[PDB]
RNA sequence: GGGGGGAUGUCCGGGUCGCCCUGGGCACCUCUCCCGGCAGCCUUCGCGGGCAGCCGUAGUCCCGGUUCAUACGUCGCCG
């Protein structure tokens, strides 16, 4: 009968929140979501929720791809990346693991 | 000075308030004086209470025996505790650093003591 | 966001129970007197000022 | 297991009408956890549920319909019953829950049940051993506290009973607060009674010996001066109350001189174990300086051993270097003294003798 | 005050002061105990100033008389706190006897 | 004047542009006065001031070796004693100053030191 | 020790690097040329410029666009500049919290700033004004990474912990509010080994932003947050508030006392160091009006709300759901009843000068509690759902008693004793059923006198024992108990439990992979609102 | 009575120590008196303030004027704390019912003073 | 701090009288493990664990006997 709704919000990440191209948009580092704000109204344009799951992960690390824009590739304590494309979402269901011991860094 | 006691605390004096708390008599003139007077002389002794705490051995006294000689005037009119409801919170801060003011005393009262010796030395010698 | 540099206020301390009012302090700040005597040291039957 | 208790209060009202005492105490038994033996202490006692304290106390005590009713002992000797005295299952909330059904129009029922309960125990019990272990055991209210110790006074005003189950009511009324027992015992207690007890806990205080002189409390506190407010200023309408101010203001002045005296010999105790502890230092030869005279520094200050903890910036901490820890002995060294060497310092065993001028 | 308690620097603020200085601290300190209306931080003050110069209250005995004319209104703030209990108690159960 | 002494080398690149490296209290007074020397691979300077200490720094191995804090007391000992006479000497600017010490030290082994 | 650092690379090639890198010690380095000097066996001798400002540890250090200015900052609150063409410093000097991190725009025209308190700034360069401002929740959380000041062992090292769950209250007549406390921030909170919130922040649930922020104790958000010994500072906790019902009032209640290492001198016989912060501990409470602006605006303060001998800590509060009553518990036993009157001394009425008259709070009734010792107590309260009763948990060891009250008459109307096993936690009033916790759970009828629901919860740390809460719901008669899964620790888990009120079975099992910090019921409809210490907020509805 | 006080407390006498403690002169002898024997009388006091608690007028002001004249003897003899530790017990079974016993006299000394009154309405009658 | 020992110096019964001891007083050096922290290094994501660990005291070749602090935007008059 009781029903749970979405775990929404979350604490900022230490990870660098990074500027868009144009300097438009802001992509900001929680726990759990990321998300990309306008600057100009100051105002949120898309949450992206990322299923965490294994006792204590985080999003270890977090980047705009360099080759191309509007890509992020994201990281954990294990070694699960994805590469979302804000402005969207296509990315979040389909992490890779890369076999580690525990993912400590990553820098694209 | 009884009379004067009434005169003065129903037109709301202090100067002559002043002429009485100036000065046995006390006991004389509270057992002089009338009821509802009393009460209005509790409320403002409690404004002099709030308003001036250092040497106590007069008005403390004397509101010792106003509730002496007409303490039962304000159970026969009870409606003004608020008159009595204001001492009660003026009391307890006087009280506040009697958590620690005997405590005061006994590390200072020996270090005058010490003196009382160090005076006891040199007159003698 | 900066933080407004504002200095140390006063502690808001309690007041007895008889406090000085707008009304007395009003009455009090009546200051300025001028005694002045009458003619002869007459007392004043009756002084007036119209509207 | 609601179903469950029902049939076993029906089974228990089966052994009622059946005036089977003895099975449904050894029923009562079984649930507590006759023979009827006792563990020695009414703290360990095994944990039984409110509906089993309910039911018994329901079948043991009850009620009168008048308009004022009135609990009689429907079982006057019964083990149950003392276990439920030692284990303190009599509260007026217990009863009150028991006896939901007709209290529910009676007012002023605290008053009533607390007045009456221990009365009710005192004609069970002439020694009332078992009134000082309810007295002990039960969580009290004033009423019922005050009803108690009238009875011990009745009693007196296997001779130390009643006198423990004064001083355990003492401390539970000591406990309670002020206007309730004034109230309460305004209700129940007469001038001379109170009177008596007034010279109860004169005889309690001079005996203390607070009066009687050297060189030849709460408790007391609230229950004295409670019980006479509680009686206030109908009841004496003298020189014994003048005499008896007298030795009040002569206990005052001094438990008075006794925290002065409280405050000097507490620092005077703490400055000379931290001497035993920098003197001890000294004959180790750590070099403090501390006092050489027989008088006492006006400075109650002893000189510490060096914190080896240096606090840096911002608030870490590396310990401290001997260069420091020199220069800190440096200073602490004074414009005079006699720094005598060992033929054991200069074979490398032993320690010097150091001799500073009186600073 | 209330600022130097609050900010821990009242040990700060007062262990480095002078004979004239903790003249004119402890002038202030003695008179303004008898307010209870400061008299716990004032006496907060007053236990620093006790650990931080009595030592040399030999050495200057107007000091010693200051910290003399401590105690000489202490003596009878111990009257003041307690003939307030005393008249504490006096107004209680005058409430009490009303009802 | 802050008991305080800094140092400061060129800016890789920008010419002409340099900037501080760091600082550091050395004295307990000002440093009044200084002089630099390098030579027979001994690169020093002496900073002098009012704490009566000289100090020396390495120039070439600075922030590489220790400093060195002479003696603030001069050379000779300026200390005379008459052992018969137990008599201690001390001279400065005009005067000399005589201590006698008028006692052995087994004797005391406070108040008379 | 490394904190962290950035690089500006020279330059179509790479010419060289600049390396800058900031340490714990509050220390910045930064080497010149490390290609030039590492291409060349040997090499020269190779030294960086030192710069030393921060107290603390340095958090975020990069470079100004074409690299002329140092930009940094960390946990003393300033966004300090190093000049690095003369030996001047910049700063933007009062930030509300630690310097988590700094950001470069791709031109040198917008920082962007991350803030201890859950918050992110993006400025404009030489205005530094806000012109993009986002904040969060600023719940206290336990740190994945944990602290970039925890590495050199200061006098009190920082550790991710929460001693006491949080304090928050929806808004009633405006459900899509919530008013919670923080402090200027979280690792600012949590240092000093206390709980240090003295700020309020008001919370939108609709649209999850942090609406907006005001202090109630005594603040100095520009003054110095780190006393001289190295100790930052502990604050005045707002430890207990509770709405009023009506949509207007709010009465708090703040905690602070000295430190232990800070008293060191008023012990004179068994006096300890506790004796001394417990004797001058200092509890305000005051009376706040609130405007639809969610202005909250003084009324009253009173300073002794509790007092005997010395003062006595104030158990608990509550609203009255029909009147602007709020009664109180305290360490005096007594039971105090606050309502407010118009200030009018001897027929004049006291007007705010725009013409309102100035409302002023007072103590209506006073009730004292009768006491049962058998042979440290701890009070709760919760009115009834109508009101015209009080039910008052005193909480010694084990012996404890609920005592209802009436509120037209100061009398009481019931006393229920021995429904504790221990010292209370809290308790609840449902329509007609107490739902109370201490070391056991117990849902108690009283029209009926009769316990209906009861558990024996699992053993646990007394850390995770006080953090178990409770609430209830109101509108469809289900409570709630918050509760972690067994000192506490990084790898915790939690569990909440749907209560409905006339049953023992769950209604709602859900653990949680990290400690639920505390549930809220809305006010409007049914359900809760449950936020957790990796701090992320989620509602439970039925249906 | 200051050799009197030497004599009694090195002999252990309780006789003479009763006879200097009948009866300023107390000033006297404390600074007339030596210092471990300040130590021993310390001691014994002790016993006589935990067998005999009644009117302390005299021998508490005589530990004062102990601490007084030579109480800088057991700093510079400290190893005999158990003197000291053991008054350290005495003093605070001394202050238990000081958490109420101010709380003895309000209520009390009240009804005291409602005699006062009580006195007061008759002698005129 | 304890539990304990080997050894230093000491008085009162003392002993054939000497090595000292038992009975009382003992302060110290040392060793011993159980008190509090501090580090590292493997382990597991972490929770935890393991490993060989130091310190709870004193004077250095020099020498860390150091390094560290919180903004502009506007002032004056008088109500």
Redesign the interface.
């Given at each position: 009968?009781?029903?749970?709704?979405?775990?929404?919000?979350?604490?900022?990440?230490?990870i660098?929140?990074?500027?868009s191209?144009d300097?438009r948009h802001?992509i900001?580092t929680?726990?759990?979501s990321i998300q990309v704000?306008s600057?100009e109204d100051?105002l949120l344009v898309r949450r992206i929720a990322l299923p965490?799951?294994?006792?204590?992960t985080?999003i270890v690390s977090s980047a705009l791809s360099k080759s191309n824009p509007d890509y992020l590739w994201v990281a954990c304590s294990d070694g699960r990346i994805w590469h979302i494309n804000w402005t969207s979402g296509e990315g979040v269901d389909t992490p890779s693991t890369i076999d580690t011991k525990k993912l400590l860094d990553m820098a694209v | 000075l009884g009379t004067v006691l009434n005169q003065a605390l129903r037109t709301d004096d202090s100067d002559l308030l002043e002429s009485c708390l100036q000065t046995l008599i006390i006991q004389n003139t509270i057992n002089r004086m009338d009821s509802s007077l009393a009460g209005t002389l509790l409320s403002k002794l409690a404004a002099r209470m709030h308003r001036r705490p250092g040497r106590a051995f007069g008005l403390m006294r004397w509101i010792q025996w106003t509730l002496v000689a007409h303490g039962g005037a304000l159970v026969t009119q009870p409606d003004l505790i608020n008159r009595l409801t204001e001492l009660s919170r003026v009391l307890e801060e006087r009280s506040r650093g009697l958590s620690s003011l005997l405590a005061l005393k006994g590390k200072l009262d020996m270090l005058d003591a010490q003196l009382k010796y160090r005076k006891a030395l040199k007159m003698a010698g | 966001m900066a933080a407004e540099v504002v200095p140390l206020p006063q502690l808001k301390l309690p007041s007895g129970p008889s406090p000085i009012t707008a009304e007395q302090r009003y009455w009090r700040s009546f200051k300025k007197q001028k005694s002045h005597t009458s003619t002869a040291n007459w007392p004043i039957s009756h002084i007036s000022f119209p509207a | 297991s609601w179903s469950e208790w029902q049939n076993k209060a029906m089974q228990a009202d089966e052994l009622l009408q059946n005036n089977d005492i003895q099975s449904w105490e050894e029923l009562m038994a079984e649930v507590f956890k006759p023979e009827w033996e006792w563990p020695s202490s009414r703290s360990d006692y095994a944990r039984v549920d409110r509906r089993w304290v309910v039911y018994a106390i329901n079948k043991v005590f009850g009620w009168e319909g008048q308009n004022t009713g009135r609990l009689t002992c429907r079982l006057p000797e019964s083990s149950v019953l003392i276990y439920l005295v030692d284990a303190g299952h009599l509260s007026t909330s217990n009863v009150k829950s028991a006896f939901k059904d007709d209290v529910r129009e009676v007012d002023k029922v605290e008053e009533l049940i607390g007045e009456q309960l221990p009365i009710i125990l005192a004609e069970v019990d002439p020694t009332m051993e078992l009134l000082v272990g309810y007295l002990s055991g039960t969580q009290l209210g004033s009423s019922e506290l005050v009803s108690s110790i009238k009875l011990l006074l009745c009693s007196l005003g296997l001779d130390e009973h009643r006198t423990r189950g004064l001083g355990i009511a003492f401390s539970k009324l000591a406990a309670c607060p002020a206007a309730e027992t004034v109230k309460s015992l305004r209700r129940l207690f007469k001038p001379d009674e109170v009177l008596v007890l007034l010279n109860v806990l004169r005889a309690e205080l001079i005996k203390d010996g607070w009066t009687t002189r050297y060189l030849d409390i709460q408790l007391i506190a609230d229950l004295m001066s409670r019980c006479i407010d509680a009686v206030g200023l109908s009841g004496w309408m003298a020189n014994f109350f003048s005499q008896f101010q007298a030795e009040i203001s002569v206990a005052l002045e001094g438990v008075m001189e006794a925290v002065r005296l409280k405050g000097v010999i507490a620092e005077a105790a703490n400055y000379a174990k931290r001497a035993r502890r920098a003197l001890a230092d000294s004959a180790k030869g750590k070099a403090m300086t501390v006092h050489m005279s027989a008088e006492l520094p006006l400075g109650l200050k002893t000189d510490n051993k060096i914190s080896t903890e240096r606090v840096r910036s911002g608030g870490e901490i590396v310990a401290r270097s001997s260069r420091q820890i020199g220069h800190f002995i440096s200073k602490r060294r004074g414009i005079y003294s006699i720094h005598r060497i060992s033929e054991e310092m200069l074979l490398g065993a032993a320690g010097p003798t150091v001799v500073q001028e009186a600073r | 005050l209330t600022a130097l308690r609050h900010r821990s620097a009242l040990r700060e603020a007062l262990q480095g002061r002078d004979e004239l200085s903790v003249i004119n601290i402890l002038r202030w300190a003695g008179k303004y105990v008898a307010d209870p209306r400061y008299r716990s931080i004032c006496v907060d003050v007053a236990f620093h100033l006790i650990d931080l110069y009595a030592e040399h209250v030999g050495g200057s005995a107007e000091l010693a008389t200051q910290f003399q004319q401590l105690l000489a209104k202490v003596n009878r703030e111990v009257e003041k706190a307690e003939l307030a209990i005393v008249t504490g108690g006096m107004v209680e159960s005058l409430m009490m006897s009303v009802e | 004047m802050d008991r305080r002494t800094a140092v400061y080398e060129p800016m890789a690149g920008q010419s002409g542009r340099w900037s501080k490296v760091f600082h550091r209290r050395y004295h307990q007074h000002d440093v009044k006065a200084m002089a630099s020397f390098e030579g027979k691979g001994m690169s020093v300077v002496v900073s002098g001031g009012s704490d009566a200490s000289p100090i020396v720094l390495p120039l070439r191995a600075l922030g590489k070796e220790f400093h060195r804090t002479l003696p603030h007391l001069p050379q000779h000992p300026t200390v005379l004693s008459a052992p018969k006479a137990r008599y201690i000497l001390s001279w400065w600017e005009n005067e000399i100053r005589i201590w006698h010490l008028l006692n052995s030290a087994q004797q005391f082994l406070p108040l008379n030191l | 020790i490394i904190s962290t650092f950035d690089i500006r690379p020279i330059i179509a090639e790479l010419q060289d690097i600049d390396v800058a890198v900031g340490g714990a010690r509050g220390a910045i380095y930064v080497y010149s040329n490390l290609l030039a000097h590492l291409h060349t066996l040997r090499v020269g001798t190779i030294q960086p410029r030192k710069y030393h400002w921060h107290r603390r540890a340095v958090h975020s250090v990069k470079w100004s666009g074409d690299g002329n200015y140092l930009i940094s900052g960390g946990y003393e609150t300033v966004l300090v500049l190093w000049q690095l063409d003369t030996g001047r410093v910049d700063f933007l000097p009062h930030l509300s919290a630690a310097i988590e991190n700094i950001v470069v725009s791709p031109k040198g025209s917008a920082y962007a700033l991350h803030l201890d308190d859950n918050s992110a700034m993006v400025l404009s360069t030489a205005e530094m004004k806000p012109s993009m401002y986002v904040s969060g929740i600023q719940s206290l959380v336990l740190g994945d990474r944990p602290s970039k000041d925890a590495l050199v062992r200061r006098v009190w090292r920082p550790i991710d912990e929460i001693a006491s769950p949080l304090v928050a209250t929806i808004s009633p007549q405006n459900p899509s509010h919530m008013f919670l406390c923080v402090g200027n921030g979280q690792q600012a909170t949590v240092g000093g080994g206390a709980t240090s919130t003295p700020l309020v922040q008001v919370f939108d649930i609709s649209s999850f932003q942090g609406v907006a922020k005001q202090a109630i104790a005594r603040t100095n958000p520009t003054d110095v947050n780190i006393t001289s010994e190295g100790v930052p500072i502990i604050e005045p906790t707002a430890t207990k508030l509770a709405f009023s019902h009506d949509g207007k009032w709010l009465a708090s209640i703040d905690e602070w006392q000295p430190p232990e290492r800070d008293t060191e001198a008023y012990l004179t016989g068994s006096k300890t160091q506790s004796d001394a912060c417990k004797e001058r501990r200092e509890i305000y409470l005051k009376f706040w009006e609130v405007g639809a602006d969610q202005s909250l605006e003084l009324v009253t303060r009173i300073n002794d709300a509790h007092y005997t001998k010395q003062t006595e800590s104030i158990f608990d509060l509550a609203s009255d759901p029909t009147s602007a009553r709020f009664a109180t518990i305290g360490n005096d036993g007594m039971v105090r009843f606050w309502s407010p009157k118009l200030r009018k001394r001897d027929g004049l009425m006291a007007t705010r000068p725009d013409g309102q008259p100035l409302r002023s709070w007072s103590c209506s009734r006073v009730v004292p509690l009768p006491v049962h010792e058998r042979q440290p107590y701890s009070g709760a309260i919760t009115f009834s759902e109508d009101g015209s009763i009080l039910f008052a948990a005193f909480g010694p060891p084990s012996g404890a008693l609920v005592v209802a009250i009436d509120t037209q008459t100061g009398t009481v109307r019931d006393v229920v004793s021995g429904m504790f096993k221990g010292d209370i936690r809290a308790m609840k009033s449902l329509s007609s059923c107490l739902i109370m916790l201490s070391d056991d759970l117990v849902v108690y009828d009283i029209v009926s006198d009769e316990m209906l629901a009861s558990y024996t919860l699992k053993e646990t740390s007394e850390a995770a024992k006080k953090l178990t809460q409770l609430a209830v719901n109101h509108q469809s008669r289900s409570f709630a108990l918050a509760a972690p899964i067994p000192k506490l620790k990084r790898g915790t888990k939690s569990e909440l439990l749907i209560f409905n009120i006339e049953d023992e079975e769950p209604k709602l099992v859900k653990t949680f992979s990290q400690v639920i910090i505390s549930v809220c019921a809305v006010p409007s409809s049914s359900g809760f609102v449950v936020v957790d210490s990796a701090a992320q907020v989620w509602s439970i509805t039925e249906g």
């Open positions: 009968s009781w029903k749970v709704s979405k775990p929404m919000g979350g604490r900022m990440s230490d660098d929140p990074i500027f191209q300097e802001l900001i929680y726990n759990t704000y600057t100051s965490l799951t294994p006792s204590a985080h | - | - | - | - | - | -």
